[PDB]
């Protein structure tokens, strides 16, 4: 492949991280860090190790170098809704989903 | 305090319309390689003139 580097669960929602990794896409690879390392919150750090991966992973599987690359595809898919139960008052329902999300990010070239 | 039909996917994002973060517009500092927050100076060691914390 043109080097990949997924996560797997990691725990933190679909929409929550579909956010962050929208800034990444198009340009990037060098811009990888800069625009994560600053842009705040949590979702946007569980990308800044799947990018350091998807780079060393292009210095192994792929012989490509740390300045090229592109980041031609990212998407966050819906990981298993990790379920449990909450109290409340009387009890009724506490669906409470601890929701999760796989990561996959891919860098290649022009 | 409840709806009656189901707020379709179509509308799913017609709130979501606005969010899709925006990121930066950063600059460097005369002394770090290309770091610098938008207001705090050299991350690279930490300073602006000189002895900000522990430097050179």
């Amino acid at each position: 492949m043109e080097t990949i580097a997924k996560h797997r669960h990691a725990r933190s929602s679909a929409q929550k991280v579909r956010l962050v990794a929208d800034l990444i896409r198009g340009k990037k690879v060098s811009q990888a860090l800069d625009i994560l390392t600053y842009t705040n919150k949590k979702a946007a750090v569980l990308v800044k190790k799947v990018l350091e991966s998807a780079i060393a992973n292009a210095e192994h599987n792929d012989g490509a170098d740390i300045d090229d690359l592109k980041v031609t595809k990212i998407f966050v898919d819906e990981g298993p809704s990790m379920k449990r139960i909450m109290p409340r008052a009387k009890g009724r329902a506490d669906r409470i989903l601890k929701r999760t999300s796989h990561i996959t990010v891919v860098v290649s070239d022009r | 305090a409840v709806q009656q039909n189901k707020p379709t996917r179509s509308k799913r994002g017609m709130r979501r319309s606005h969010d899709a973060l925006t990121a930066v517009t950063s600059l460097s500092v005369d002394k770090t390689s290309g770091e610098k927050h938008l207001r705090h100076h050299i991350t690279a060691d930490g300073y602006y003139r000189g002895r900000k914390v522990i430097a050179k």
Partner: peptide, 16 residues
């Protein structure tokens, strides 16, 4: 060392 190959180096050996 090109400021990303630097962000590497400086750390890949703040390991060794």
């Amino acid at each position: 060392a090109s400021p990303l190959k630097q962000q590497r180096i400086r750390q890949k050996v703040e390991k060794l």
